[PDB]
Design an enzyme around this catalytic site. Sequence first.
Site, mmCIF file in Angstrom:
data_model
loop_
_atom_site.group_PDB
_atom_site.id
_atom_site.type_symbol
_atom_site.label_atom_id
_atom_site.label_comp_id
_atom_site.label_asym_id
_atom_site.label_seq_id
_atom_site.Cartn_x
_atom_site.Cartn_y
_atom_site.Cartn_z
ATOM 1 N N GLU B 263 0.815 -1.213 0.000
ATOM 2 C CA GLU B 263 0.000 0.000 0.000
ATOM 3 C C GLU B 263 0.847 1.261 0.000
ATOM 4 O O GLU B 263 0.392 2.309 -0.466
ATOM 5 C CB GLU B 263 -0.951 0.002 1.191
ATOM 6 C CG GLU B 263 -2.202 -0.805 0.961
ATOM 7 C CD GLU B 263 -1.945 -2.284 0.969
ATOM 8 O OE1 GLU B 263 -0.786 -2.674 1.176
ATOM 9 O OE2 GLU B 263 -2.894 -3.060 0.755
ATOM 10 N N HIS B 266 1.208 1.656 -3.816
ATOM 11 C CA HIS B 266 0.014 2.233 -4.432
ATOM 12 C C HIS B 266 -0.149 3.700 -4.059
ATOM 13 O O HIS B 266 -0.514 4.523 -4.904
ATOM 14 C CB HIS B 266 -1.243 1.463 -4.030
ATOM 15 C CG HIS B 266 -1.369 0.110 -4.655
ATOM 16 N ND1 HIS B 266 -1.670 -0.068 -5.987
ATOM 17 C CD2 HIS B 266 -1.290 -1.130 -4.119
ATOM 18 C CE1 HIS B 266 -1.738 -1.360 -6.251
ATOM 19 N NE2 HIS B 266 -1.511 -2.026 -5.134
HETATM 20 ZN ZN LIG Z 1 -2.183 -4.094 -5.208
#
Ligand SMILES: [Zn+2]
Lengths: 439, 439
Positions: B263, B266
Amino acid sequence: KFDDVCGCDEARAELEEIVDFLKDPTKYESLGGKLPKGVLLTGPPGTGKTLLARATAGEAGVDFFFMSGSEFDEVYVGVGAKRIRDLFAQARSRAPAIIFIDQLDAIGGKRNPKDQAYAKQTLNQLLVELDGFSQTSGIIIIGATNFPEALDKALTRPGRFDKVVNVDLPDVRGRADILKHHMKKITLADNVDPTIIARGTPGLSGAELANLVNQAAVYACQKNAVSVDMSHFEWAKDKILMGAERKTMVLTDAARKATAFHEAGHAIMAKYTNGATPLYKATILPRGRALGITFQLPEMDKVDITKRECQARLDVCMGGKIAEELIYGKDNTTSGCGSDLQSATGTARAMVTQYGMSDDVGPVNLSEEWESWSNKIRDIADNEVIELLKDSEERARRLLTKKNVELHRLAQGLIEYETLDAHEIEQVCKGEKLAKLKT
Amino acid sequence: KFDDVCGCDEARAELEEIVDFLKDPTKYESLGGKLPKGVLLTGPPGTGKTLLARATAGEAGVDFFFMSGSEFDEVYVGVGAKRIRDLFAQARSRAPAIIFIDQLDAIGGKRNPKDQAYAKQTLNQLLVELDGFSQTSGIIIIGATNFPEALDKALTRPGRFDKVVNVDLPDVRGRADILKHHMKKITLADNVDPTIIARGTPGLSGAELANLVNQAAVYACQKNAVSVDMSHFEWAKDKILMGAERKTMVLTDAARKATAFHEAGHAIMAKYTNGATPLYKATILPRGRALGITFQLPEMDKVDITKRECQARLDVCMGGKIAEELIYGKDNTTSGCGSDLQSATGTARAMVTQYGMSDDVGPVNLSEEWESWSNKIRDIADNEVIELLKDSEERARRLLTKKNVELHRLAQGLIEYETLDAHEIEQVCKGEKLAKLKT
Ligand SMILES: [Zn+2]
Ligand SMILES: Nc1ncnc2c1ncn2[C@@H]1O[C@H](COP(=O)(O)OP(=O)(O)O)[C@@H](O)[C@H]1O
């Protein structure tokens, strides 16, 4: 109460919040909060669902109005509507209560009009009297079926059964606590680890664990033994998982040494390979289905699979074919090794057509629409699968060409003792006597 | 009542016209007008179409007859048509009635002439009921469908379905009205600006707003709160957008670290790339059906993305795999990056075929009729889909090599806090304190 059910916590949590509505409604009513009329319990068959509704109703101070759906197929109906309005009228007499309905598919269903006439009469008697009460300070209907497809559509509308919760197959500590809860009734023996057989049955229900403990206690009880040790539990586990034991098989010694080199191949390069699931009880018993099994015991998620574990299990699936090549020459490879090949192929395609583990295809999901792609990408993808399995058997060839001594030691060790633990496999591969009666 | 449908002022104006026709015919029947024999509502799911139909029906004093198109089982040959003949047969006995047919596109589709016998008996019976031989008087049919372009030419004929009211997805001033309306039913709200939540949630519909409010009220009930304040609305909002939170079973420093790097990838890709939508939150918890989720959310509502936005999506969906290969090396790329490649695959393939955003392919639509086109064109198209994804992961790699310090910062703070909104990420990226509590 919520102590009697074991595992299935993600359903138990929402059941304690709905029961937080159930023992005190006026707090949720005074602010204007609303929660559905009846909840729907789904999932695999027989995972402790009636014990969840009886557990909620038992830990709260309420009444538990149980009724089955399939009992409405015992007779001609028209009277079943009358006992339904008897049931909900009695539920409005005893206002702190909940109403559990088992196998809801038999009440609903999509059937022929000769029986959809009066079956629809009992069905919409239920549909009307799901509407004939104010939700305030009332009752919550709990309905349960394992077939979400077979339910009637109009019964699933908003204004009726709304919040759908799933009761699924438990995880490792769930099966550990289910197995312990059934161990709380029979006579155990020693440090009987429930977590070494909890993992070991991947993805199986709770009632079959009651069959495991129950049949294992039977099997210990006919031997006139003292108590139930680990051998009985792994005995009944290896019956329910694979199959029975053939004590009547008369077989040659070339076959026993051939399968000994097969299981010794899987055991060695399952043991020495970087990243594999660790080794466990290997045998050459014809346990029903197979002839010689290596066991392996992991404990993580499958989301923690990687490229190192995928290439590890591709190297585990070549020890039999490469062992039988390196001992018995080339032109004497059997056919049962080909069965192992299909497992290898499955893993290999997941390394190319779902993940990013191939630098020649590219990062894509080729799996969800395989027919849509053209032939050139399928040539590159399938070619990468082929060189992936060829590189796997090359690594298996060298790591079994430099460990030949443990191959013969573990081989004739499996001929002489025919059941070995990973500790005992380590004692065999060192050339040590291992203090056990041979067979 | 028409007040209950807050939002959709002009369409509601349209049905108000029909109810005005019913309440006094002579004002409209003085020059030769007549009731529209059929009205067709269009719009995405859950935008309040049945609500409008019950508005006209329950407001004008006529019987309302509900029937769904996805309810016709189509297991046998005859029923379905028998349901329609019975339904219309009962509606004619209540002359000024209204018949609402929901999800027409499940029974009324393209009458392919090469369908053997029974696929289109229901549709033909429906056609003969709407505009058949014997005429009908005082009946109004309201059909609610999601895909007007899927209905056939015969069923959407002027004479069966006269008008086509379009109920589209609400905008910000509409969402403010829905939230005002459903908050109004609550008796208590301390100080809450509806335009806050309205501007905060672009894309949601009427139903999701209603259960937003209801879930906030229930959540205020559970915590034994005194009122319904804005933090509750934030909990329910994040619940509906990002997914229902799940109680944290367990984690390790290794799993938690690797997830925080995913994350983190991302999120960093979301921030520093160009064209991407704004960022909303990054999370390290098991929310909904995923292990952590970095949720983006547009400021303004867009109808269609350009080429730079979609290339931005392709670049954002590579941060997981590229981050984990920068940190954990190539041989440790996990298999949790399958959804990223699924989504990115979808985006690129819709870029090339439908949207017409590739030069060597051409300005042609290849999406529909995918079977008819030859293999040459499929080879070129798939070549550019794969080339485009490879280029995307190239850009994501070359950028995440420039943001090592920000990456490790945001990942570490994301371990320490388990949740972050875009402002807090903006502070953490510059090595500043956030003024809140660890873990
Ligand atoms: Zn992913
Ligand atoms: N314009 C609106 N005003 C108020 N509520 C709305 C509106 N549009 C949708 N809703 C909400 O959406 C929910 C679903 O309504 P429904 O009529 O079943 O949706 P649909 O007709 O799209 O299937 C209701 O709870 C309703 O309050």
